[PDB]
Write an enzyme that holds these catalytic residues in place. Structure first.
Site, PDB file in Angstrom:
ATOM      1  N   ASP A  39       0.843  -1.195   0.000  1.00 23.38           N
ATOM      2  CA  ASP A  39       0.000   0.000   0.000  1.00 23.38           C
ATOM      3  C   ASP A  39       0.884   1.254   0.000  1.00 23.38           C
ATOM      4  O   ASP A  39       1.975   1.246  -0.592  1.00 23.38           O
ATOM      5  CB  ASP A  39      -0.963  -0.075   1.206  1.00 23.38           C
ATOM      6  CG  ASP A  39      -2.262   0.646   0.976  1.00 23.38           C
ATOM      7  OD1 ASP A  39      -2.239   1.899   0.940  1.00 23.38           O
ATOM      8  OD2 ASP A  39      -3.302  -0.030   0.854  1.00 23.38           O
ATOM      9  N   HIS A  69      -3.614   5.968   3.814  1.00 20.44           N
ATOM     10  CA  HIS A  69      -4.405   4.818   3.381  1.00 20.44           C
ATOM     11  C   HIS A  69      -3.795   3.509   3.872  1.00 20.44           C
ATOM     12  O   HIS A  69      -4.496   2.651   4.419  1.00 20.44           O
ATOM     13  CB  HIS A  69      -4.512   4.877   1.856  1.00 20.44           C
ATOM     14  CG  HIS A  69      -5.360   3.828   1.236  1.00 20.44           C
ATOM     15  ND1 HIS A  69      -4.840   2.632   0.813  1.00 20.44           N
ATOM     16  CD2 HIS A  69      -6.662   3.824   0.873  1.00 20.44           C
ATOM     17  CE1 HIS A  69      -5.792   1.917   0.240  1.00 20.44           C
ATOM     18  NE2 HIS A  69      -6.909   2.622   0.257  1.00 20.44           N
ATOM     19  N   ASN A 161     -14.005  -0.112  -6.460  1.00 18.37           N
ATOM     20  CA  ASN A 161     -15.044   0.816  -6.014  1.00 18.37           C
ATOM     21  C   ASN A 161     -15.851   1.420  -7.165  1.00 18.37           C
ATOM     22  O   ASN A 161     -16.336   2.551  -7.058  1.00 18.37           O
ATOM     23  CB  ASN A 161     -14.436   1.960  -5.209  1.00 18.37           C
ATOM     24  CG  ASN A 161     -13.847   1.526  -3.886  1.00 18.37           C
ATOM     25  OD1 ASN A 161     -14.019   0.397  -3.429  1.00 18.37           O
ATOM     26  ND2 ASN A 161     -13.150   2.450  -3.248  1.00 18.37           N
ATOM     27  N   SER A 224     -11.124  -1.131  -0.202  1.00 16.51           N
ATOM     28  CA  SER A 224      -9.837  -1.104   0.483  1.00 16.51           C
ATOM     29  C   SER A 224      -9.963  -1.367   1.969  1.00 16.51           C
ATOM     30  O   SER A 224      -8.983  -1.787   2.585  1.00 16.51           O
ATOM     31  CB  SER A 224      -9.181   0.273   0.342  1.00 16.51           C
ATOM     32  OG  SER A 224      -8.629   0.495  -0.930  1.00 16.51           O
TER      33      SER A 224
END
Ligand SMILES: [Ca+2]
Ligand SMILES: [Ca+2]
Length: 279
Positions: A39, A69, A161, A224
């Site tokens: 990530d 994130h 998404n 996520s």
């Protein structure tokens, strides 16, 4: 063990029904497992990680998470308050820049890094990788995720998404990994969650409280956020000896809450990750 007033998603993965607030889990808590969070990095100094997080690789100038994130996802895997597997080891691999973006060549390199690096680490209960990222279909990206899984790592990836079929996104569309859709606290498919035949499981993904950079916390939404619930659940189940890296996605699907979710398109699984913890 029982964490009162837990984030709703933790409570949800220990209940057959929505609306509860206590997270019930075996105290082993993923001890002896390892989860690589691939990530934007992990703020390992965050008190919520209790010294159990470290950065192991960066593809950028610094190993710092300048976004948040990756720290949020790592917190859902394994932070004290916000994590599924509260005693796991967390390893950060920074393939995304501080805006949350990354080139596929770098993401691929990070997956192959994990497949090798796990041979330098003492992870007696097994190894998981959480990939809260993706873009358009790429056979090379899918192949990298397949290799990581083949190497003996439980790979969990975000469905995406786009409120669309995950067949057109990578690494979501790689069959051999665990592709994770998102749900909300009323057991609806999250408004943004991808769907399709390639999904293996859903996890909590709308309004998920976790760690953030600067020693902070916040609530954000995405596939996520669902992915690390499943990665942490895998680590937890592997520590309990109930499953292995090769079989954990199937085991999670086997043992999931079935038929609880609304707005699931016909042909998409109606399966919500569940720890089946019985004190
Ligand atoms: Ca139910
Ligand atoms: Ca799969």
């Amino acid at each position: 063990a029982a964490q009162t007033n837990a984030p709703w998603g933790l409570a949800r993965i220990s209940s057959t029904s929505p609306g509860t607030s206590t997270y019930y889990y075996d105290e082993s808590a993923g001890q002896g497992s390892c989860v690589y969070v691939i990530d934007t990095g992990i703020e390992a100094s965050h008190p919520e990680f209790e010294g159990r997080a470290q950065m192991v690789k960066t593809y950028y100038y610094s190993s710092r998470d300048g976004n948040g994130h990756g720290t949020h996802c790592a917190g859902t895997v394994g932070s004290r308050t916000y994590g599924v597997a509260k005693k796991t080891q967390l390893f950060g691999v920074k393939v995304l820049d501080d805006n949350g973006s990354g080139q596929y060549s770098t993401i691929i390199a990070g997956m192959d890094f994990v497949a090798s690096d796990k041979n330098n680490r003492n992870c007696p209960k097994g190894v998981v990788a959480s990939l809260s990222l993706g873009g358009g279909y790429s056979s090379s990206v899918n192949s990298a995720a397949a290799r990581l899984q083949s190497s003996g790592v439980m790979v969990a990836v975000a469905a995406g998404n786009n409120n669309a079929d995950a067949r057109n996104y990578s690494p979501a569309s790689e069959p051999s990994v665990c592709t994770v859709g998102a749900s909300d606290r009323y057991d609806r498919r999250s408004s943004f969650s991808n769907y399709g035949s390639v999904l293996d499981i859903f996890g909590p993904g709308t309004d998920i409280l976790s760690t953030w950079i600067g020693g902070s916390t916040r609530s954000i939404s995405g596939t996520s956020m669902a992915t690390p619930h499943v990665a942490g659940l895998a680590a937890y189940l592997m520590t309990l000896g109930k499953t292995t890296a090769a079989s954990a996605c199937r085991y999670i699907a086997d043992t999931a809450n079935k038929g609880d979710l609304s707005n699931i398109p016909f042909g998409t699984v109606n399966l919500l990750a569940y720890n089946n913890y019985q004190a």
